[PDB]
Amino acid sequence: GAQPADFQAEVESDTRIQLSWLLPPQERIIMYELVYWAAEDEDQQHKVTFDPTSSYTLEDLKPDTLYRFQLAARSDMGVGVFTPTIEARTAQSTPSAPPQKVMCVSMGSTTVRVSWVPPPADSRNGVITQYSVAYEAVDGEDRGRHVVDGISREHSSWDLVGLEKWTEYRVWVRAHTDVGPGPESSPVLVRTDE
Ligand SMILES: [Cl-]
Numbered sequence: 001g002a003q004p005a006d007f008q009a010e011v012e013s014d015t016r017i018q019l020s021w022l023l024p025p026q027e028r029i030i031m032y033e034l035v036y037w038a039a040e041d042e043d044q045q046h047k048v049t050f051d052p053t054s055s056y057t058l059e060d061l062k063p064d065t066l067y068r069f070q071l072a073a074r075s076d077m078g079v080g081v082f083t084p085t086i087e088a089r090t091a092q093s094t095p096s097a098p099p100q101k102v103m104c105v106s107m108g109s110t111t112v113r114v115s116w117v118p119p120p121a122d123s124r125n126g127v128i129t130q131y132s133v134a135y136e137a138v139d140g141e142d143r144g145r146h147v148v149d150g151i152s153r154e155h156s157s158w159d160l161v162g163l164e165k166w167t168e169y170r171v172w173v174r175a176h177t178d179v180g181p182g183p184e185s186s187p188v189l190v191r192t193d194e
Contacts, residue, residue: 001024001029001079004072006020009067009086011088014064014090015061015090017058017090018055019069023054024073027073030052030076031049031052031074032049032052032053032071032072033079034047034050037068040065042068063091063126064093064126065089065090070082070084070085092125092179093125094125094126094177095125095128095177095183098119098173098185098186099116099117099173100117101115101116102171102173104188106192109165110161110163111159112159113159114158116185117156125179130150131152131153131173132150132174133174135160135170135171137168138169138189165193166193167191170188170189171190172184173185
C-alpha cells in the first residue's frame, strides 16, 4: 500500500502513546507494520503488525522516554514504504524501586544518620527530585511512624534528630519524582546510644 498519510503521535500516559493516520483511499489494505524505538537506543527496534485501522495505542512503554515511530501499509500489492519518522515522549512516572544500600548508624543518644544511594537508573522513571525518610520506634512509648520529606536530591544521608535514648528504630527511605513517591526501602533497624 501507499505510504501512510498524516501519521501522528499523541502522548497518553507514562506508558502509552496513541498513533493515528489516514485510512488510505481506494486501496485493498490488509495490515499495518509499526516500527518503533527509543531515541536513546536506536540499535534496538520493535515492530508490531496489526489488522487495518486508523489508530493504534502502544502500551507497556518505558516512562519518560523519547520514542520514534515509522509506519508502513501492506495491501494486496505488498508492503509499501515507511512514513518519515515521528516522535513523542512518554510522561514521567513515580520511581518503581526504592533507594538502595540503606544504612543507619547511631550518632549519639538522640541522633541517627541514615544513608542511601538512588534507586537503579532504569526504575527512576524521571528525575529524582526529593527523598523522604520514615522512622518508627520498635519499643517505648511513641510507636507511631514519623516522616521527614523534602530532602533534596543531592543528599545521600540525613540525620534523624530528637530520638529517644537507648531506643530501637525502624527506618525506611523513599525516592520521589515530580509525579510523586516511589516505594520505600525495606526497613533498617538501628538503636540510639546510652
Ligand atoms: Cl511514608
